[PDB]
């Protein structure tokens, strides 16, 4: 039984590999060599935030490109006004080690979590004005890595227990749970349709789960090391994955394989975040070399470098409209570039 | 300048006041990371340091300064990822069952893994060989010998510069010093001075438990201020 099942699994893996190789008519480079060059993208710092106390370990852009949520390792969430630089909201968290934060698409709820294994969603438009604990949901036997809002009543979360889960705000329980991975899930990324979302874990693989049914429609198994960041393409047909090997990989849902591997010899420090622009040409990724890079999703050439920070960059995010890009590092300073 | 913008600026200034008031305490605090397997007596240590939650924070004041010890015993076995967030902490207290020789190998493996970590490379790792009475009773009974697990224990001579405590049997002293020597060898390996180990023999009832944390963190901060300020 066990031996027959192992042999069948190996045969299925070999068949999937052969099918993926057959569809690999050519690499993205051969087709992205005719497109005109993107040139150097020299982004300058337009804003400088000096409110955070501890290492910034999360960030996200809500429906409005003016408010920016950022979480610090001291258990503090801060909603900044990107334009005026003012502090729109300050939320003290009961958990000091917060590693994830997201801004609901309605601008009324903000999620957070971390080593506490309890996802806390606070409401910003409460009649009482002050920030109140809207839903402190638990059930995951592991640290929370990332959070993303799907609507004003549901929220997807990934925990260190290797299992992601979509919870309901009103009910405060798992609307659905996905099968466990081989390692701890470290990042999440929602698709523009909100129906599917791809997630990577410590294991060198990324699974594309569905919100309707708890099943990974696709499972890419192409990485050197532990994936630490993942981002969805603005269209929803591809997605970038970044690990600690200092190499990003752009996988495709239609082709079901890697398109181009963004890597360089002079870059040896791992990656911590990945993000795209409103168009997708500029792929932004923060590296452990105390800086961020911006490559061409098509040409794969180094388009820009951001070395304003002084500590290891922790997270970065592009606005929904693409006017600027926020970057939070361990230097307790968040910088907006444009 | 609009009035709403001025009110928002005033609210931001108040939030900055509060953030500075909190950062004062933050900077003035000392974060400690308690690590240890299930067999380790970390629970007994937390119970003694009284001067689905994957994190447990415990604040205790010693010599008029606070210490926030963080225990993590409700998470998955592997800890190569969530351990990175605990950088820049004051110290790391590793617990090990010095009496149970069976789990000593896994304890040393975990200690070496936590020491050679790339992110915690510059973080000191304090060591409390808890459960000393059990180890003494075991080595005195003679039913369990460390030689069965470690052959070097058969060809290991008692340190000449040792400091046997009053009333300790030669076998107990030799065993504890061999354990300490093994730990110091595993620590100094690729240490480079940026981080050094602090082993201390902790009993199960010794009230002078947080005092060890204080004395270790004092030297840790002393070396950190000698290095950063270019005096060593």
């Amino acid at each position, epitope marked *: 039984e066990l031996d027959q099942l192992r042999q069948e699994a190996e045969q299925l893996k070999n068949q999937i590999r052969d099918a993926r190789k057959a569809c690999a008519d050519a690499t993205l480079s051969q087709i992205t060599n005719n497109i005109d060059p993107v040139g150097r993208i020299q982004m300058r710092t337009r804003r400088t935030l000096r409110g955070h106390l501890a290492k910034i370990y999360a960030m996200h852009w809500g429906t409005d490109s003016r408010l920016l949520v950022s979480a610090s390792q001291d258990g503090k969430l801060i909603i900044w006004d990107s334009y005026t630089t003012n502090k729109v909201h300050a939320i003290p968290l009961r958990s000091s080690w917060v590693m994830t934060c997201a801004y609901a698409p309605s601008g009324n709820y903000v999620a957070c979590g971390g080593l506490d294994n309890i996802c806390s969603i606070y409401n910003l438009k409460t009649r009482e004005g002050n920030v109140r604990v809207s839903r402190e949901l638990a059930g995951h036997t592991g640290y929370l890595s990332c959070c993303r809002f799907l609507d004003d009543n549901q929220i997807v979360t990934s925990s260190g227990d290797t299992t992601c889960a979509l919870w309901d705000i009103e009910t405060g329980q798992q609307t659905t749970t996905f099968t466990g991975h081989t390692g701890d899930v470290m990042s999440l990324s929602l698709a523009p349709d909100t129906r599917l979302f791809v997630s990577g874990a410590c294991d060198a693989s990324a699974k594309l789960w569905d919100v309707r049914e708890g099943m990974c429609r696709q499972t890419f198994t192409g990485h050197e090391s532990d994936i630490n960041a993942i981002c969805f393409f603005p269209n929803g047909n591809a997605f970038a994955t970044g690990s600690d090997d200092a190499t990003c990989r752009l996988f495709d849902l239609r082709a079901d394989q890697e398109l181009m591997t963004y890597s360089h010899d002079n870059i040896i420090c791992g990656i911590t975040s990945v993000s795209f622009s409103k168009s997708g040409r500029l792929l932004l990724a923060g590296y452990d070399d105390f800086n961020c890079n911006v490559w061409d999703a098509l040409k794969a050439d180094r388009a820009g470098v951001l070395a304003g920070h002084d500590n290891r960059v922790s997270c970065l995010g592009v606005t929904d409209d693409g006017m600027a890009v926020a970057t939070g590092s361990w230097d307790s300073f968040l910088k907006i570039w444009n | 300048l609009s*009035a709403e913008d001025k009110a928002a600026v005033e609210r931001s200034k108040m939030i900055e006041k509060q953030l500075q008031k909190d950062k004062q305490v933050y900077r003035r605090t000392l974060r400690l990371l308690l690590l240890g397997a299930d067999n380790s007596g970390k629970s007994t240590i937390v119970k003694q340091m009284r001067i689905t939650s994957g994190i447990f924070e415990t604040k205790f004041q010693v010599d008029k300064v606070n210490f926030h010890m963080f225990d993590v015993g409700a998470q998955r076995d592997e800890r190569r990822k969530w351990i990175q967030c605990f950088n820049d902490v004051t110290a790391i207290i590793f617990v090990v069952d010095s009496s149970d020789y069976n789990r000593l190998q896994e304890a040393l493996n975990d200690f070496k893994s936590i020491w050679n970590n790339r992110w915690l490379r510059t973080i000191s790792v304090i060591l409390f060989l808890n459960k000393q009475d059990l180890l003494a009773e075991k080595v005195l009974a003679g039913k369990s010998k460390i030689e069965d697990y470690f052959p070097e224990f058969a060809r290991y001579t008692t340190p000449e510069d040792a400091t046997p405590e009053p009333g300790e049997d030669p076998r107990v002293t030799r065993a504890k010093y061999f354990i300490r020597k093994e730990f110091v060898d595993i620590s100094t390996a690729s240490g480079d001075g940026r981080h050094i180990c602090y082993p201390h023999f902790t009993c199960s009832v010794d009230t002078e438990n947080a005092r060890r944390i204080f004395n270790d963190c004092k030297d840790i901060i002393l070396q950190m201020n000698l290095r950063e300020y270019n005096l060593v």
Partner: single-chain antibody
Amino acid sequence: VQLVESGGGLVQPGGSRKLSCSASGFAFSSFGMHWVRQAPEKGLEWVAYISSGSGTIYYADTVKGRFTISRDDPKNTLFLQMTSLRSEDTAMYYCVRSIYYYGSSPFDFWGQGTTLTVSADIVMTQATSSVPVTPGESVSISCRSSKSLLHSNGNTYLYWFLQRPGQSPQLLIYRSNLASGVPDRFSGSGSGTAFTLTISRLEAEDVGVYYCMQHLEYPLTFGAGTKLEL
């Protein structure tokens, strides 16, 4: 959320009085307070404003010197001490909460207020003061201003307050952006000079006085107010 005012009554000329306001159901310190007066058979008129933490205070050019506002945060209370009360001071005073930030709705909750009887800023002028209309039809109230409220930032500093018989003014619009707790029937349009409040379907609860307010500059000034009756 409640703002209970007290201290009103009859006062002789030249006297003094401390009007108190107890706030509950929210963080009193987080919301700036505004004392606004309404004369009998007339519209509203801003009096004083105190920011959070008492870091900033403002008064109207006509009320400076006499009235002084203060706030006790430990007790979540507001106080307004008036001295040398004149004959014109006869009016009903209301305490209003307002928090200022992107996406907020300043002046969202109006207190019940208390009546006290005796014995170059931007001006808002409305065309019509009373418009007869029955349920089922739509209403279009107009408003004119002497200075363009469109600031360089692009925010429309226009506030609409609906005061019903026996109730306090209720916020309808704070910036086209509908206010909280108000149905979608009310809408706002216009440029920085002219403004229009449109009600698509009238109801029995819509009868009342609609007042317009500008917030470009700290010194405020309410309009005459347009009345809608059955």
